[PDB]
């Protein structure tokens, strides 16, 4: 409809694929070579289904600030026949609060979903289903089952992947450019 829907369906159209688990279907973001990332509680095994096609785990990490603290990211690398655009430089390198975002979703439940959620705060801590949880993104939009995984960007940035929310608000776990380095 406007600027911020222009960028978040340019990282959707070329940047993300269909992951299922045996704990559900997730928006998967692609970041660069077969490297993509997932919510943690999406639980990654040996083999993962991408656009319904069966596809070794080459590696998996699931990431924990120094404290070690869950930040609910896991870093995927995909036995693909195919690379991702290179997003990286679209990556934030400081936490920070954002105007005017979107959380975009694409399953087979929610095809084609874009949501303006609005401001985003650092929120921090969060207790995420019982587990502590750093670098959380929170915007107040009632989001829902089928979202875990969605990407919320802004104009120019790709800041969070959706991993939960209480009903009147929802979470992110941010993505930094210091995850990606190689
Ligand atoms: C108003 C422009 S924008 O922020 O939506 N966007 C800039 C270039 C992006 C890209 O390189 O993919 C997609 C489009």
Do not use: W
């Amino acid at each position: 409809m406007g600027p911020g829907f222009d960028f978040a369906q340019a990282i959707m159209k070329k940047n993300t694929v269909i992951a299922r688990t045996e704990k559900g279907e997730f928006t998967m973001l692609g970041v660069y070579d077969r490297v993509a990332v997932i919510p943690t509680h999406a639980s990654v095994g040996e083999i993962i289904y991408i656009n319904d096609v069966e596809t070794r785990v080459l590696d998996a990490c699931a990431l924990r600030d120094l404290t070690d603290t869950n930040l609910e990211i896991t870093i995927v690398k995909l036995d693909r026949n195919q690379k991702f655009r290179d997003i990286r430089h679209f990556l934030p390198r400081c936490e920070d609060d954002y105007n005017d975002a979107v959380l975009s979703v694409h399953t087979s439940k929610f095809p084609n979903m874009y949501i303006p959620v609005g401001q985003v705060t650092n929120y921090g801590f969060l207790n995420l289903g019982g587990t502590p949880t750093h670098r959380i993104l929170m915007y107040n939009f009632p989001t829902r089952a089928g979202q875990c995984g969605g990407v919320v960007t802004t104009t120019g940035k790709v800041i969070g992947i959706h991993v939960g929310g209480n009903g009147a608000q929802g979470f992110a776990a941010m993505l930094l450019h210091s995850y990606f380095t190689d």
